[PDB]
Design goal:
The chain is mainly β and about 210 residues long. It has one domain: Thaumatin (Sandwich), CATH 2.60.110.10. The protein contains four helices and twelve strands; from the N terminus they run ββββββββββααααββ. The strands form two sheets. Strands 2, 3, 5, 6, 7, 8 and 11 form a seven-stranded antiparallel sheet that branches. The radius of gyration is 16 Å and the shape is globular. Its main location: cytoplasm. Belongs to the thaumatin family. It is found in: Cytoplasmic vesicle. One of its GO terms (cellular component) is cytoplasmic vesicle. InterPro entries: Osmotin/thaumatin-like_sf, Thaumatin, Thaumatin_CS.
Length: about 210
């Protein structure tokens, strides 16, 4: 499947794409304001994620640090990024269907739109100013708004027992972005698409 990753932000982001144990395509790339990056994701990819990283510094060998979403100091991500990261999540060709969602479970750093470029389903978006409105305890110094599990490490926030409820913190993410997952047991906002669809991930879709 093809994913076009577009940076509509006025600032540079470092896009990342991974399935957790491996990079998706190149795994990462710098995207200046307006740049697009087209990637190929193998059919049958389960648990794929796309996210943006902000304020990165990399050397000539692709080793450095990012203030948000850093994946162990690499330009080309093989693993998932450090929170806060707004996440585009997908599982492709799962019994003839594609499953897409936007998640705030690992916090928020950049607004995003995740839409199909082919027919058969609607897109999802989380474009609210979550960073500006972020509760004081969830504010990440490097920028972004952390989820409560990352900050507090409790059974309730992390849904460790598989029995958790919404919280004051998850309600905040849900209020600003109803179409994104706000906690592990949130009522799914997953979108079902025909198998082998193509997509566009847009960072800062409005501004």
């Amino acid at each position: 499947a093809t994913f076009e990753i577009v940076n509509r932000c006025s600032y540079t982001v470092w896009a990342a794409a991974s399935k957790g144990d491996a990079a998706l395509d190149a795994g990462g790339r710098q995207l200046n304001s307006g740049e697009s990056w087209t990637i190929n994701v193998e059919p049958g990819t389960k648990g794929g994620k796309i996210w943006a990283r902000t304020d990165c510094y990399f050397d000539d060998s692709g080793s450095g640090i990012c203030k948000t979403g850093d994946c162990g100091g690499l330009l080309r991500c093989k693993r998932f990024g450090r929170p806060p990261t707004t996440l585009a999540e997908f599982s492709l060709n799962q019994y003839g269907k594609d499953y897409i969602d936007i998640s705030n479970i690992k916090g928020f750093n950049v607004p995003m739109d995740f839409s199909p470029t082919t027919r058969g389903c609607r897109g999802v978006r989380c474009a609210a100013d979550i960073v500006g409105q972020c509760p004081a305890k969830l504010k990440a110094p490097g920028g972004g708004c952390n989820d409560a599990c990352t900050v507090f490490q409790t059974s309730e926030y992390c849904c460790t027992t598989g029995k958790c409820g919404p919280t004051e913190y998850s309600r905040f993410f849900k209020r600003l972005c109803p179409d994104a997952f706000s906690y592990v047991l949130d009522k799914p906002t997953t979108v079902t698409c025909p198998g082998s669809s193509n997509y566009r991930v847009t960072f800062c879709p409005t501004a």
